[PDB]
Structure formats: structure tokens, C-alpha cells
Design a protein around this ligand. Structure first.
Ligand SMILES: OC[C@H]1O[C@@](CO)(O[C@H]2O[C@H](CO)[C@@H](O)[C@H](O)[C@H]2O)[C@@H](O)[C@@H]1O
Ligand SMILES: OC[C@H]1O[C@@](CO)(O[C@H]2O[C@H](CO)[C@@H](O)[C@H](O)[C@H]2O)[C@@H](O)[C@@H]1O
Ligand SMILES: OC[C@H]1O[C@@](CO)(O[C@H]2O[C@H](CO)[C@@H](O)[C@H](O)[C@H]2O)[C@@H](O)[C@@H]1O
Ligand SMILES: O=N[O-]
Ligand SMILES: O=N[O-]
Ligand SMILES: O=N[O-]
Ligand SMILES: O=N[O-]
Ligand SMILES: O=N[O-]
Ligand SMILES: O=N[O-]
Ligand SMILES: [Cu+2]
Ligand SMILES: [Cu+2]
Ligand SMILES: [Cu+2]
Ligand SMILES: [Cu+2]
Ligand SMILES: [Cu+2]
Ligand SMILES: [Cu+2]
Lengths: 334, 334, 334
């Protein structure tokens, strides 16, 4: 019926992204992906707070899927019998049936296969959306990720010049709502079902207890810091499925930024801080000019420093004293 | 003095918009509108919660006024003796006197006539603004709507091509602050005056109890769903007079979006989610490609699913399997 | 080593800005600035509420520094022995070492000299960032300001036409977190250290007690209103180092707006309300067309009217009845 070549993709866990071409001479293909839902209790902070998570492929965020404009994305969604709830998937990149959600509702023990054509370029959120009050709950429990649909000629600056990245990372930000008991300690639950009543009362007050990248406080730091070298052009894809974020690379800039995340629009240049609308993904690229540590944060600094929303980059290379120099080191006031 | 032709407009209740031309060969006219203030107790949710509303023309939002660049808008504002408070009107589209507010303060029993020239194209908020602490209270009680000022040549994509809509809807989003008693039930009041003290304490904490389109949970659903057909280009005008919103059409896109709402700027293309700044209106147009149900939401999903901010479209036409198809229906895992 | 001419600047307190050229025939210079940190208890509202402030040069916000693209900015930061905490400075305009913060940490009694090259045009935040949980606390205590880096040819509209302002004001917005005691009154503290524990618990709940321009409720009103005349083009630079804002000039517009604040991007035109992302500065220019009072607010009106975020302009000149007129004054309903 639809007679195109098929290509399988092996998804990798964020913040890494599966191998792909930017500009390509391939024509349209059916690109095949598989997502398996996992409900699990996880640790979200350095004090040992636990959380009833619901995930695609066992990670928060779900993995980034990368295709090109005109491809057909065929996803097998699997809800094993070890889960307790029905789940589905909705792609903001897709057209019709509530983004696919109306065609993908599966009980524990079932799977479904959905195909959608990638007619719109950019980065887009996907998330679970089973219906009614379950929709927010599933999403803030971790069931969201993103897809990137590239132009076949790769990215451009709007002003006919190509924009090629040397690497891409995917930072998924997650607002989490963990209730406290009378003592003021965070509560733990035996199942997602049991967490629901207390969690929903807290959610409706709209203030998260934690805001984290890659599912945990400190996930993208120390040994798991993002890396680059001076001279490298890095693309950072940032998603937030429920709540606004304001990304900022401390010590750097957004050289080229698509804050609404859609490549039919020219990027903005030379930003300090950009804005990711809740329910969207955006993308920023920067060429590193200096070595050392950078922090990538949401620039509500309370959220960054106290609620979990800080990642690090470690950058190698030579210090440029023309760009910045300590003229005189700390010394007593004359 | 000002010797131009006069044209009366009969306003219609949102989400409908009074009949108007897009591109027009008419020159400037004085366009005449009348707004009558109504204070009333209304029901805002399916559990029967009540609210002391203050409205233009008896609706939340007030009706959309549509004119063209260079027109003169002459508004008669009427505050009948059955109301209890002074009221006025401020147009963000207008220049001078706090948008008209400083020239339109009227006690119960009075009316006033204001004229302003429409020098700026786009969609703009209007709202009551009597002075001091009353300003937020009147606005979050429902006294806000919007005006659309069209270019005389109609809308364009910035890239010399015309953008004609087949229909336009106006979705006004309202953040509401209903206090709870010691039990945890929503309180009811006999008058706006009596609601004021409890309402103001809640407002200053910045978290709404409800966020609704067209004045009530479920207002734009079921029999009152928005409608379209595959192939129709629909313009959705969205306003929020006090608090940010992030509109999203589930299963669709914003083909052409003016998120800051001003037609001197080219629209952005192919958005998933857009951002309406508190105190502004924006506009998005989409051509439907698939039939079925779509939800139009703010993509803070807690607000959408739990606080009231969801509308529906029912779209007629033929399903397009090239864009999306269920390859295999729900089935047991092999 | 770096052999360029040196120029000293005398900083002035906001909302004024030190004298500078827009378009300039000067080449790159080393521009020298000095900032002295002051910790002090201040009054932030008309009821006499006090607050433990931490400031650059004794003001909230810190003063605006103005330079041109390609200049080298050399800042002497001074932390006198009368202060109690270590401090530093981070410039969003600068490249490397966490914006300078990693090179400027000074204990009470010390000073440091940092030089950075201004490679990026626009308005940018600077703020203290000592490390960890101290970062948000220092910033919301008042330790933030902004810098403007102008193109050497001055500003343009993107469409080759020059945009010259007759004056510029700097409005720094500050979200403040003052705890309440059991009575419900605001608490006072003897030192910043003692304020810390209660302040941090409140901060993590993300709702400010006050939102103020220029450090106090009513600071930019009455005798300290901003001024202009009909026909004057005024540039308003607005910063928020931690939390989003949505500026709006009541009775006017943003004729040309850089809401992300970066002059490599063309401005948007004819805005009603614009958006300043937390951790950024933006800039709007407007030519006054009418005399009288204007209010400049964040258009969350609860914040504007009840939490402190309102400034005034008093504009002189002749009223234009073509733009707006009271056709009929308040009168009894026929
Ligand atoms: O970056 C997108 C932006 O650039 C323009 C040229 O200003 O178009 C380039 O990008 C388009 C999308 O990739 C190409 O189709 C086009 O051929 C190319 O010039 C704008 O039209 C667009 O908004
Ligand atoms: O969509 C507005 C955008 O388009 C441009 C052309 O890129 O101007 C078209 O729209 C203007 C406003 O309607 C017209 O006056 C103009 O003649 C037409 O080309 C841009 O200038 C504008 O920002
Ligand atoms: O306003 C910036 C915007 O204008 C353009 C022309 O559309 O470039 C003008 O501004 C640049 C930055 O000041 C100049 O370097 C350029 O020479 C001038 O045309 C755009 O390129 C830019 O995004
Ligand atoms: O399931 N945990 O690795
Ligand atoms: O302590 N239990 O809510
Ligand atoms: O006044 N109610 O229809
Ligand atoms: O129950 N009254 O606040
Ligand atoms: O230190 N006060 O002016
Ligand atoms: O009243 N003291 O928290
Ligand atoms: Cu789910
Ligand atoms: Cu969604
Ligand atoms: Cu009113
Ligand atoms: Cu307003
Ligand atoms: Cu400090
Ligand atoms: Cu910063």
C-alpha cells in the first residue's frame, strides 16, 4: 500500500541522541521506533526522596526520536502486563486523532502500532494523554519526551547559510509534585494509584516540589556532565510538557535559537536567556569559545539552585584572555 | 467637525464574532458600538460553584469588536442603575488617557461616549480599570474582552501572500479566584462588595481556583463545541487580560501565528504551542486536514484538565490515512 | 599588552542612565567602571515594611552600564569590610568563567578587577552568584542590574532605518520574599544572615510578597515619575533577574520592541504588552503622541496594583483630539 523503504532506529537514553544525518540525500522512508512503558518508583534527589514515575523506555524524559521532513514515523507502543494503568501516546508533530492519542490507548498486556507523516519541521513534544484528569497526572509523572523533524537540507540561519552541529543533547525538564506529611517530610507511596489522590490535590495548587533535568537532581553533573571542546557547535534541545522554562547557559549564549522550536522560522541570534512554553520544545545552538565549567539552568534561580534544575558542561581547550581576563586578583582594598 | 460616514455594529456573544469584511475597499468610517455593564452572580463549574461576575454585555469575555486600520471607534458605555459600582473602559488599541479609562468613569445610572482612532493593527485587550486595587478585581471578575483592527488589505504571511480566514472564533480565557471556607468548599457571596475582602486576599497569592474559556468549565464543548470542516481555514483569537496562557490545538498546529497579536509583524509558522502574555491578545490560524474531535487547551495541562481550560472542535470531512493511520489495532503482546 | 585608550564612566542611580553616545565614530576603548557592594536594611513599601537588601552601588537595581560593541569593559568590584558576606559578579553579556563569577569572588575587605570584551549587542543582566543556594538569595535580595551594548552605528529598525532615542530609562523589577509571623505581619530581621532561613523557605514556594520597580512601592511616581514630552522617543530598558514580567505602557504602545533584548534581531512593532524572561533584559521604544499621565506596569494587574509593580510617566504637550476624544461626558441614561 505505502511502498517505501523501512529503517529501524535504536533509541538511546537522554541526554544522548541516536545517530542521524543532518542534511541527507535519502528520500522519504518509514522510520520504525519502539517505546515500552515502564511504571517504577525512583529516587529524584540527593536526600533519597522517592517518586512514582511513569516513563517511556524507562527514562525521564523519554528518548528523542529524530527523522526528516516527509518521513513516515511508525511507532510500536508496548504496555507490558507488569504495569497497572492504560497508557497512550500523542505526538505534537502529528496531524489528527489528538496527535495519535485517540488511536493508541492500550491496557497492560497490549501493544499498538501508529504511523504518522512528518509534515512539520522542528522539535516537538510527545506525551501520554489517556483522558480527563489522567492527562496531567501521567505527564507530570514523567510520560513525555520529544521528536526532532529536520529539513532534508539540514538547518539554516535564515540569512541562506547552513548551520551544522557537531553534537546534540536533549534536556528534558520535569516539574514534579511530591506531597509532604504533617511533619513536613516528603511522602512515599506503594503504587502510582495510591499516590494519585495526594498528588492531584498538590498539582491543582500549581507549585512543584522539584524541577529536574533528566529525571533527578544532579543528573547532568559530575561524571554525567555534558561535554564539549572550544570550537564545537552544540545543539541543545529542551522540552517541557507542562510548565514554562527559561533556559540559560551560564558563561555562554544562544548563538542561534528557535525558542518556539520550529525550523520553518529563522532562529533569533545572540540570546542570553530563552523561553520554552509549557507543552513545547525548543532548540539553541552555541559554539564554545572558552574552556571550563558552564551551568545550564532555568533562570528562575530558585528552581535552578533549590528545586533541581541545573546541569553542567565541562569544556576542554585553551583560555582566551582577549574575551575575558582577571586583570587583578582578589586583594585588600587600598 | 469629524465628517465621516457612520456604521452601526450589532455585537454578538463570544465565541462568535460579528460580521465584517477582511480586505475592504471602504475608506475610514466612524464605527459605533454599545456596551452595557452587567454585574451578576453566575455558575462557573459543573459542581454548581457560583461567582460574582462583572461583565461587558453580560458575557465573559466581552464581545469582540472588529474594525479596520484608520477607522474611528465610537463606543457608548452604559452603567445601569441596577449595578452597584463605578466602571470604565480602557482599550489597549487606543492612544492617550490610560487607553480611554481616564475619560470613561461612570457611576450606576450614567453613560459616556468615547471615540478613538485605530492607528495600530492587531488584536488588543480592552478592560475595566477604575483605579488602584479595583483594577485587578474588576478584570478578574470578568470585565475584559478584545478588539481586532485589520489592515485594509486583509491579513498577509509576510512572504506578499494573502491569508484569508473562512471563519473566526474568539476564545477569552479568565483566571478566577474563588475563596474556600474552613470545610474546603467554595464560598458564595451576596454581592460583589461582600466577595471583595476574601477575593483580594486570595488574588494576592496569585493562584487561581479556576481557569475557564467563555466564562465556565465546559462552555465550549458538547453542543457548544467550535466547528469546522476539513479544508477550512479558521482564525482563533485568544485573549488573557491578567495572566499568561499557552494555547495548543491538540491534533493540529498553528499554521500562521501572531502570538504577540500584532499584524505589522509577520506571523510565525508551524507552531505546536504559542504564548499569550497576560494583558494581551494573540491570533492563530489553522487549516483543518483531518476530521474528528480536537481539544483546544492551555498547555499547562493541570489548568486544562482540572481547572477548566479546555474547549472542543468537532470537524467534519474525510479521514486522511496518508497523514496518520493505525497500522495495527490494540492487541496482546506476542 | 592590550594597548587601547581608557575611558572612565561615572555611574548614575536608576532609573537614569549615564551619558553616552548612540552612534559613535570612536573605535574600541577600555571602559572603566566601579561597583561597590552595600548590604543594608531598607523600607520597601508605604506601610513601613523593611527588608534586608544586598546591592551594587547601594541601589536596586544596580546601575546601567552602557558601552559599544567591541569595547572592553573593565570593572572594579569592591566588597568593603562593613559587609558580612562574600560576593561576586556575573555578566550575561560576557563569555567564559560563568560570566565572570568564577573570577570575582571577594570577601569583605577585598576588591577584584575583571575585564571582558563586549562581543554581543543588546541589553543583558548582571548579578551576584556566589554559589549553590546563595545564588537565588543574593539575586532576590537585590544584587542585580544590567548592561547595554550598543552597535557602533546605533539602533536600527531592521527595515535599514535608524532608531534614535531622545532619552533612556532603566526600570529594574525585583521580586522580593518577605516572611510573615503568626499574626500575619511581615517580619523584620537584624541581618541578612538571620533573614536567610525564613526567606529561603518562602522562596522555595515561588510566590513573592512584593514586586517592585526601583526597589520600593511607589518609587517611580509622584515627584519621581518618569517624564517626557509629546514627540519624544523614549527607550525603556526593563530587567528581571529571576522571574518573568510583562511590561505594558497604559495609554501607549511599544513602537519598536526587542523583548528578548538583543539588537542583532530586528525589533517587533506596535506591541501592547511584551514579555521579559526571568534572567534577561529587554528594551522598548515609544514616541509619545498624547500628554497626561501614563502608567507603566507589569500586566499581571494583581502584581501591578497590589504587590508594587507600577511606575508613572507625566507627559507634557498638546492633546490630540483626532486620536481620542470624549464625544459625550458622563450623563444620566436617557
Ligand atoms: O530559517 C528559515 C527561514 O529562512 C528562509 C529564508 O529567509 O528560508 C530558508 O529556509 C527555508 C526552510 O528551511 C527554505 O525552504 C528556504 O528555501 C531557505 O531560503 C525563510 O523563508 C524561513 O522563514
Ligand atoms: O506580515 C507583515 C510583514 O510583511 C511585510 C513584508 O515582509 O510587509 C507586508 O505587510 C505590511 C503590513 O500589512 C504591508 O504594509 C506591506 O506592504 C507588505 O509587504 C513586512 O514589512 C511586515 O513586517
Ligand atoms: O535590526 C537588526 C536586523 O536588521 C538587519 C537588516 O534586516 O541588519 C541591519 O542591522 C544589522 C545589525 O545592526 C547590521 O549589521 C546590518 O548591516 C543592517 O542591515 C538584519 O540582518 C538584522 O537581523
Ligand atoms: O530499573 N532500574 O534500573
Ligand atoms: O501525615 N500525613 O498526612
Ligand atoms: O441573566 N441571565 O441570562
Ligand atoms: O468558614 N469560613 O471561613
Ligand atoms: O544609606 N542610605 O542612604
Ligand atoms: O511569629 N513567628 O513566627
Ligand atoms: Cu500514561
Ligand atoms: Cu500535548
Ligand atoms: Cu468595572
Ligand atoms: Cu490593560
Ligand atoms: Cu552577593
Ligand atoms: Cu544569570
Amino acid at each position: 500500500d505505502l511502498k517505501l523503504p523501512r529503517q529501524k532506529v535504536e533509541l538511546v537514553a537522554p541526554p544522548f541522541v541516536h545517530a542521524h544525518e543532518q542534511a541527507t540525500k535519502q528520500g522519504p522512508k518509514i522510520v520504525e521506533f519502539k517505546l515500552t512503558i515502564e511504571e517504577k518508583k525512583v529516587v529524584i534527589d540527593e536526600k533519597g526522596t522517592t517518586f512514582q514515575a511513569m516513563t517511556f523506555n524507562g527514562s525521564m524524559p523519554g528518548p528523542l526520536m529524530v527523522v526528516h521532513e516527509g518521513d513516515y514515523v511508525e511507532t510500536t507502543l508496548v504496555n507490558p502486563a507488569t504495569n497497572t494503568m492504560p497508557h497512550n501516546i500523542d505526538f505534537h508533530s502529528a496531524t489528527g486523532a489528538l496527535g495519535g492519542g485517540a488511536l493508541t490507548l492500550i491496557n497492560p498486556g497490549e501493544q499498538v502500532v501508529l504511523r504518522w507523516k512528518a509534515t512539520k519541521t522542528g522539535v516537538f513534544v510527545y506525551h501520554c494523554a489517556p483522558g480527563g484528569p489522567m492527562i496531567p497526572w501521567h505527564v507530570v509523572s514523567g510520560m513525555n519526551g520529544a521528536v526532532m523533524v529536520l529539513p532534508r537540507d539540514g538547518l539554516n540561519d535564515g540569512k541562506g547559510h547552513a548551520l551544522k552541529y557537531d553534537k546534540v543533547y536533549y534536556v528534558g525538564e520535569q516539574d514534579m509534585y511530591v506531597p509532604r506529611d504533617e511533619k513536613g517530610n516528603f511522602k512515599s507511596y506503594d503504587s502510582p494509584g495510591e499516590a494519585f489522590t495526594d498528588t492531584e490535590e498538590m498539582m491543582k495548587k500549581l507549585i512543584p516540589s522539584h524541577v529536574v533535568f533528566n529525571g533527578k537532581v544532579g543528573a547532568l553533573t559530575g561524571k554525567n556532565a555534558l561535554t564539549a571542546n572550544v570550537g564545537e557547535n552544540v545543539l541543545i534541545v529542551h522540552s517541557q510538557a507542562n510548565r514554562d522554562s527559561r533556559p540559560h547557559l551560564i558563561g555562554g549564549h544562544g548563538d542561534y535559537v528557535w525558542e518556539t522550536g520550529k525550523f520553518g522560522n529563522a532562529p533569533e541570534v545572540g540570546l542570553e536567556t530563552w523561553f520554552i512554553r509549557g507543552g513545547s520544545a525548543g532548540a539553541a545552538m552555541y559554539k564554545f569559545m572558552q574552556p571550563g565549567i558552564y551551568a545550564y539552568v532555568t533562570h528562575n534561580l530558585i528552581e535552578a539552585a533549590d528545586l533541581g534544575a541545573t546541569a553542567h558542561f565541562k569544556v576542554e581547550g585553551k583560555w582566551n584572555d582577549d574575551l575575558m581576563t582577571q586583570v587583578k586578583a582578589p586583594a585588600e582594598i587600598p
